[PDB]
């Protein structure tokens, strides 16, 4: 059995979230939670919330056991960008992109 | 540095207002043109 959890339209760059996603790919859930608790990054909080949601879904909707779960898949994709205007010198204007991402976590007992 | 726009309501109304436009034959032509185009605001007067 595989169980999914997602966070869509998250306020961060995919490049920045992938750095933290790469630390927990293929680990046991307890080990992964310990790793996330001691990473001084903002993406760690978001990733940790998603992992906790996935574990709760596996317990409640599928009758799973916590001690047998592993992080079988994790990935981050790009989302829409918001466009803004920032003035510069001598009356010239630039464009600013505000990037977002989607985060997906899959836990399994096999 | 001093710039080009220095506001004043009395001067605005004496220069571009409805009665000033009505006082002359060319001002009436401005008003007819703007009515024919269908503008929502016809002069600068409130």
């Amino acid at each position: 059995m595989e169980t999914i959890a997602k966070h869509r339209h998250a306020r961060s760059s995919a490049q920045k979230v992938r750095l933290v996603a790469d630390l927990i790919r293929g680990k046991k859930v307890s080990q992964a939670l310990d790793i996330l608790t001691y990473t001084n990054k903002k993406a760690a909080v978001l990733v940790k919330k998603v992992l906790e949601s996935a574990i709760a879904n596996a317990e409640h909707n599928d009758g799973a056991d916590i001690d047998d779960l592993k992080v079988t898949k994790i990935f981050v994709d790009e989302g829409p960008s918001m466009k803004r205007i920032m003035p510069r010198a001598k009356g010239r204007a630039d464009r600013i992109l505000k990037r977002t991402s989607h985060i997906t976590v899959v836990v399994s007992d096999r | 540095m001093k710039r080009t726009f220095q506001p004043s309501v009395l001067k605005r109304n004496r220069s571009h207002g409805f009665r000033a436009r009505m006082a002359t034959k060319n001002g009436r032509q401005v008003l007819a043109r703007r009515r024919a185009k269908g503008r929502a605001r016809l002069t600068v007067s409130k």
């Binding site: 750095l19 933290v20 790469d22 630390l23 310990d34 790793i35 001691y38 990473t39 | -």
Partner: protein, 55 residues
Amino acid sequence: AVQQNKPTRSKRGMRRSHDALTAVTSLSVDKTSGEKHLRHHITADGYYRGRKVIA
């Protein structure tokens, strides 16, 4: 000064090959409360090396 040709995704990856993060090797266990903590740091309940320090 600016580029004359556009760099490639291969070169982007090669430059980024030094950007990976490092994880903490291991955690320590207090001898009285049993909690896990960073080595040489106090725990989240206020213990260090078996003694309560902060109430």
